[PDB]
Design a protein around this ligand. Sequence first.
Ligand SMILES: [K+]
Ligand SMILES: [K+]
Ligand SMILES: [K+]
Ligand SMILES: [K+]
Ligand SMILES: [K+]
Ligand SMILES: [Mg+2]
Ligand SMILES: [Mg+2]
Ligand SMILES: [Mg+2]
Ligand SMILES: [Mg+2]
Ligand SMILES: [Mg+2]
Ligand SMILES: [Mg+2]
Ligand SMILES: [Mg+2]
Ligand SMILES: [Mg+2]
Ligand SMILES: [Mg+2]
Ligand SMILES: [Mg+2]
Ligand SMILES: [Mg+2]
Ligand SMILES: [Mg+2]
Ligand SMILES: [Mg+2]
Lengths: 78, 116, 117, 177, 52, 135
Amino acid sequence: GSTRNGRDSEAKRLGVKRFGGESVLAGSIIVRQRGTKFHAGANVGCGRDHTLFAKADGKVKFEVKGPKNRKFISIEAE
Amino acid sequence: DKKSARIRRATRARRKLQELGATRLVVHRTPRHIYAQVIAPNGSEVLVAASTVEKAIAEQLKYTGNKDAAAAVGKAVAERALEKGIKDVSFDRSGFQYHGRVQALADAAREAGLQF
Amino acid sequence: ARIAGINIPDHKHAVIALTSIYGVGKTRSKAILAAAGIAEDVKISELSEGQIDTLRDEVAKFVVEGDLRREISMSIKRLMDLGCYRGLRHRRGLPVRGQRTKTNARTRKGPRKPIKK
Amino acid sequence: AKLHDYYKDEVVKKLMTEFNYNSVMQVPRVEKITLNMGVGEAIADKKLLDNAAADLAAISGQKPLITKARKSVAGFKIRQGYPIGCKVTLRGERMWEFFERLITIAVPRIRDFRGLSAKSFDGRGNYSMGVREQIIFPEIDYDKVDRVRGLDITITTTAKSDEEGRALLAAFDFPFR
Amino acid sequence: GIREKIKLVSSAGTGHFYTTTKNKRTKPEKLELKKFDPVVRQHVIYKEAKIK
Amino acid sequence: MLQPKRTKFRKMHKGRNRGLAQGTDVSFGSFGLKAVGRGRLTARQIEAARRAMTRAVKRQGKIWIRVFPDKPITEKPLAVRGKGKGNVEYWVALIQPGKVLYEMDGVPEELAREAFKLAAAKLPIKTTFVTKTVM
RNA sequence: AAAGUA
RNA sequence: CGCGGGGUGGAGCAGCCUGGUAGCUCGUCGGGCUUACAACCCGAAGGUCGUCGGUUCAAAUCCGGCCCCCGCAACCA
RNA sequence: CUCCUCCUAAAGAGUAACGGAGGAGCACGAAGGUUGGCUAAUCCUGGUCGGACAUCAGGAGGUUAGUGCAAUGGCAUAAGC
Ligand SMILES: [K+]
Ligand SMILES: [K+]
Ligand SMILES: [K+]
Ligand SMILES: [K+]
Ligand SMILES: [K+]
Ligand SMILES: [Mg+2]
Ligand SMILES: [Mg+2]
Ligand SMILES: [Mg+2]
Ligand SMILES: [Mg+2]
Ligand SMILES: [Mg+2]
Ligand SMILES: [Mg+2]
Ligand SMILES: [Mg+2]
Ligand SMILES: [Mg+2]
Ligand SMILES: [Mg+2]
Ligand SMILES: [Mg+2]
Ligand SMILES: [Mg+2]
Ligand SMILES: [Mg+2]
Ligand SMILES: [Mg+2]
């Protein structure tokens, strides 16, 4: 006999690229994600594939804010 | 609920203004009165304010809940803001339509000198 | 052209038009017209309202339309729940006035029902 | 307007004495009257919906709104978005005039009429009734009708229960049985 | 793959064209859009034509 | 023979069987048969023990089965070499020490002990007789 | 032109 | 076991592909022609499509199992 | 036999097998941009034809809906209408 399985897709290398406290340059990707598990905070942008990236030089900061206890990433100016 | 509906209506623009770090000119309208505040970018400090519940403004109006009162409040808030030296704000309609009394207030503030 | 809660034809003679009421036949229609003082051969289209209103109370003198239907239904229901011979005939849909059932009786029995196998 | 004045000038005090309300704002009010036609045969001939809408417009003195299917239903061969009804919402003066017309003219002209059911309340003081034939409304000419058509009438009331709803309706001499 | 390629040709006479696709069975009407012509450096009308 | 009426998936990874059990108290009856060992209980075993118990008490009292065979087990047929996972052949419950497997009520303790001994003789895992505790 | 049986 | 094709009025066979009640012939039933039967003529009825699940607003139909049947293949040492 | 989604995969990434399960080889000039507005499923009760299920009204409920098409991650400030 044979199997009807045997397929998969290539790994997409998502996840956090710069962790809390890391110094980054403007433009740096901070996290790659499907949809907004993390949300964009101060000095952070959200791209068309929901990548969060730095809009200014500084240090990465994660926090939980708002009425829904959501996770936000911001850049602290250094 | 009307109030919750209006708050939902206003949230997107308010979050955009906070992200932009703008100084807000927030308007609040009731059937009897209209109010205006100029709020610092942190969202928790009021720089200037003017409304029809103030005696100095309400004493010169036949009725505090119409377009003439709205224009008076807009002019007063713009004059006080210019006296404080602000000159640059973003209008926050707070979920009310940009129309009627709200629009008359905004037009009066623009005429008096606020840039928005 | 509105008597006893229904609409009567306007292009017909009064005597013919009145029979459209449930509970009014030719004889009762003739009696009602005689009581109202209206000719039988006059179309109700050319009748003034002052004649329709005098026809209406004459019609109301009788038991017609919904009242008559309720009365007939009540009498048949009384037979059925009494369970006499006539009531059983009404229950089973067979003729109730002693007609033959070996043949005929199609009005009471409906169309023919062929035997299955 | 006549029935509105009648309400404000007798019904308020009648209901206040009957139910011992502490405020006039507690008195049940007639919020709205909604007329509906479920024209499920328009899927075969949409012109039937047009005729039904014309009849509703004649009856209520208002332009009706065509209502579409909320979802596809296999049982009735309708897809989502199919226009299958028409409704009219009456408030204020139009509501009061229609209420007066319905109470004093149309309801007595109902075939074999013997009073409206007092159990046609939804539990929160709103009333619903069904008119089998539109010809009871004098605005509809019996000679020009191409097809008999019924409708549903709902009176939505600010009452809190069926007893208060029926008291308010009976204060207008509603023809209950 | 029923959609066919088409070009949108500048009305400014420059020869500039954009390309896109179209469902020709459902929308037989010609596509017409205002788009930027980089030759004359203005937005102008562009009209559908065959792909080549 | 217990077996899920339906399942999300037909086949399951082998997995492992570490830890102590949850559900170590007589919770429904007065007496219980508790596992002391670790292992798998097939649906056939569960049912063989149930039969032994029930006939011992003459269908008096009440009996609960606290375990359910929800894990499918596949086998490869004879004379087959790979080529995909084998076919589901039976169903098991994973058992850890401390698991109460059956409970009884409405019978004397001596009879319950006898019935449970007859049942344990059908099972591949060591067991012990337990009684309800107040706390 | 087509007419089998008892 | 592997690869295919199937299962639909009493029988043989369409429709299935491509989602919106399914047909033909023989057969059966009632009537007619005949002294009677056959042949012949007229009229009528009879299946929710092998069994379950899933998708779907909707399944004879698409998908996934299960049962029965048919045809190939199941080999080198 | 190329591509996508989950699991295996051992809480960063990556990670094999003729391992376990499903999909793609498009669609859309609006189903794209923006401004303004809006909020679901399901059930209960009352209501002409109307029925288990059509449209109407009220209530409960709170996203159990929705997303052009798999699955995962998302989505109310909606990315849903
Ligand atoms: K007889
Ligand atoms: K005869
Ligand atoms: K109410
Ligand atoms: K993983
Ligand atoms: K758009
Ligand atoms: Mg993957
Ligand atoms: Mg008569
Ligand atoms: Mg493990
Ligand atoms: Mg465990
Ligand atoms: Mg012979
Ligand atoms: Mg050879
Ligand atoms: Mg990992
Ligand atoms: Mg790891
Ligand atoms: Mg490696
Ligand atoms: Mg490797
Ligand atoms: Mg692999
Ligand atoms: Mg494939
Ligand atoms: Mg918007």
